[model samples]
Structure formats: C-alpha cells, structure tokens
Target: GEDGYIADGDNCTYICTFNNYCHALCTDKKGDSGACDWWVPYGVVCWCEDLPTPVPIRGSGKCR
Candidate 1:
C-alpha cells in the first residue's frame, strides 16, 4: 500500500500577527512538515499531512 502525504485533515487554527508566527505554531506540532494554509479573521489555519492528529489551539476565546 502506498502512503499518502495527506490532502486535508488535522488542521489547527491560531491567532497570529504574521505568516511566520502562524507557521511557527504548526511547526511545533509537525516539525518541518507543518504549513500555513489560509487565513481566517485575525487567525490563520495550519495544515500538516505528516501528523495524524490535530493539535488543540483554543486560545482564551481568541477564535470565534
């Protein structure tokens, strides 16, 4: 069986000031495999195919 890198899943969202910061959060979870996918309001979404589970990023009601 061929292993897939992952298309969509286990994505985390966080509040960030810049793209780099957003990427940093993902990196913490998936090392270098994490990547920032898109932006949402004052936060950004991080996606990682290498990781099997999504990390909890709830920040004091920062995300709505």
Candidate 2:
C-alpha cells in the first residue's frame, strides 16, 4: 500500500503532492555516509532518517 514517495535533502524540506506520503532523501552531508533520509512535513518541521531502500517518486496517485 505504501510505495510512492520522494527524497529530500538534509536540513531541507521534501515537497510531495500527497500530504500523507512517507519518503526520504539522500543527503550529501560530509562525515556522514550518503543515505536516503526519510522526511515528513508538518507545519514548520521536517524530519529525516536513513532508509535501507529509498522509495521512488511517482506522477499519479496522491502526488499530482
């Protein structure tokens, strides 16, 4: 059921079409191994984390 999602940057915001989309972004941060960090947008908060397998961005569905 959960498949479509996008990536975001470290300290950056992930803009997805869906308000309930769960995704992460590969941050090119130094000292930290490159990884797909999950991000969730809520008000002025943006959370991020490393994912084993990053999800891809789609065109249809909740994302317009």
Candidate 3:
C-alpha cells in the first residue's frame, strides 16, 4: 500500500533560492522513487530518490 503522506500520482515541484537565484524542477513519482534536478548557489546535482513528505507546522523549539 502507498503511504498517504507522500504525493503519489503527479509531478512535484520544488524550489530553493540562494544569493538571488532560484532553482526548481518537477519530479515524477515512480513507485517509491522520484527525480530531482536543480542548481544551488554552489553547484548542481541530480539524482533519484524517495519522495519527501511535508512537515507539519510546530513550535520553533521543536524544530531545533
């Protein structure tokens, strides 16, 4: 059975910004794995891995 938290049927978009530049990509879900491609302020790295679930909002102390 699929885990309910992870997005399962569509592409996921993610973006990270650093030094005034933004990097983003769409990752397709394949079983338990997915794809990612983007550039950071330092460099670029591409890979396939399991999808990540969204974290719930909580107290700031809990995040530390």
Candidate 4:
C-alpha cells in the first residue's frame, strides 16, 4: 500500500513487505491464478497477485 490503497491489480493483489518477512523469498508469477499485478521493492516488499513463491536473491538475509 502506498499508504493503504492500491491503484492496480486486475482482480487480486498478494503483497509481502520487508517489514513483514525476509526478502529471501520473492516471486512475481501466478502460473496458477494466471498473471496478476505484482510489485516488489529493491530490498523491501515482494508483492504478487498470484500463486507464486519467492526464491533467494543476491543479498537475502535473516533479520528480526
């Protein structure tokens, strides 16, 4: 959410942020629910509107 709203997504929008979980997992594909609007920050959020799963990236880490 830019604050608490989305101006995109055809029908669905699944979002995950760095403040939520680790960016170690990220995928912007919906091979199941078809293609959905997806977004992810460089090292912040991993947003997707499909049945996609995130994989490890370059600087993936574990911080709590």
Residue 18 in model 2: shift from native, Å?
Answer: 0.8
Off by over 4 Å in 2: 1-9, 23-64
lDDT of 1 at 15: 40
Per-prediction TM-score to the true structure, in the order listed: 0.36, 0.19, 0.17, 0.17
Count clashing residue pairs in model 4: 1
Model 1, 1-64: lDDT tens per residue? 1111222233325443455654565566564554554554434454444443444432334323
Writing each residue's lDDT as its tens digit, candidate 3 over 10-56 gives 32223333312211121333324323335522223223344344421
Which ranges in model 3 have alpha carbons more than 4 Å from their true place? 1-31, 47-64
Task: Tell me how candidate 3 scores on lDDT.
Answer: 0.28
Please count the clashing residue pairs in each candidate, in the order shown: 0, 3, 0, 1
Ranking of predictions according to lDDT: 1, 2, 3, 4
* Candidate 4 C-alpha lDDT tens digits along 1-64: 0122111333222344342231222222222211222343332333322232232222333222
Local distance difference test scores for all models = 0.42, 0.30, 0.28, 0.27
C-alpha root-mean-square deviation, each candidate:
7.9, 11.8, 11.8, 13.6
Error (Å) of candidate 4 at residue 54 is 17
Sorted on TM-score, best first, the list reads 1, 2, 3, 4
Q: Which regions of candidate 4 fall more than 4 Å away from where they truly are?
A: 1-10, 19-64
Question: Which should have the higher lDDT, number 2 or number 4?
Answer: 2
lDDT of 2 by residue, 1-64 (tens): 1222233323234543432332223232211122222343322222233323343332333422
